[PDB]
Design a protein around this ligand. Sequence first.
Ligand SMILES: CCN1CCN(c2ccc(Nc3cc(N(C)C(=O)Nc4c(Cl)c(OC)cc(OC)c4Cl)ncn3)cc2)CC1
Length: 305
Amino acid sequence: SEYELPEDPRWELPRDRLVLGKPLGEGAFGQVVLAEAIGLDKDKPNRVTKVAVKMLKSDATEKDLSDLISEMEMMKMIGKHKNIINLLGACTQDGPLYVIVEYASKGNLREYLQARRPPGLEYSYNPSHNPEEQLSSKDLVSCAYQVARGMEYLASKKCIHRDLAARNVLVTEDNVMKIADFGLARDIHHIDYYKKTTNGRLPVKWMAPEALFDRIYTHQSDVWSFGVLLWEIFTLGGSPYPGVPVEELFKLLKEGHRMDKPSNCTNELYMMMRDCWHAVPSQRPTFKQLVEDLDRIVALTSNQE
Ligand SMILES: CCN1CCN(c2ccc(Nc3cc(N(C)C(=O)Nc4c(Cl)c(OC)cc(OC)c4Cl)ncn3)cc2)CC1
């Protein structure tokens, strides 16, 4: 239980200043909740901010604490960007480790897009019982731009996400896109391809071929994944490679088969997808060029549609 937790007075927040609310989600030997932090900014001690706090579960082992510290310390090294989930504070003293980060009210991007789906031929059915206002064409390109910006920053800081999907992007109340779970430590063991997360997702579909076969992870493998993410944006939370099992995906990609253009998508944007989906990693575009291009398309894309 003790354990030597590093104290960092700049990130340190007192526990009586944090009021723990409802759970946000459940991870590996750790759980996230909503909370209200009183006086997050020290020259404004009387203000409350909604935050997300990560804490270990009952079944958590020594390995899990080291991971949690690693994740926290990793966010310190990467620093702040608006388009990623940022470290706010932590409680290392007088109790269990709490890691306080930015809160995105509107949930993950996959559920955000699926709830904003218009009825029609171009998109699938809206799963949400309380559907929201539909998104414009500019909003969607803008969404892609933000994710790229955030990924561009993580790239400059030498962070490789290695799982990048609409699920791993979160949306705030201000409808700012923020990359989530970027600071994870890579497992030393081999991964089970058929294995699903707590949500029932297969990550293999976002993996570049080199990562899928030879388990090689680069910034370029994230670009491939960003192609899959782009596809998800313009399918409004569509499932990649529908009705394709793992075994069928291995062969499909080797033969050079790629996903079909989404019903509502421009050729320029589908070319961007195909560029990220390029077999040879060196021939894929960089996030730097993806930001430069998307910045241009957003201005050109009308907000009326
Ligand atoms: C319809 C059913 N839904 C209801 C909405 N729900 C939901 C999902 C996500 C959110 N928003 C969130 C979620 C999170 N989560 C889950 C979260 O884990 N945040 C977090 C992140 Cl992203 C980190 O990145 C490195 C690091 C962290 O601690 C080190 C944490 Cl704590 N952090 C901030 N906002 C809010 C609600 C998901 C289930």
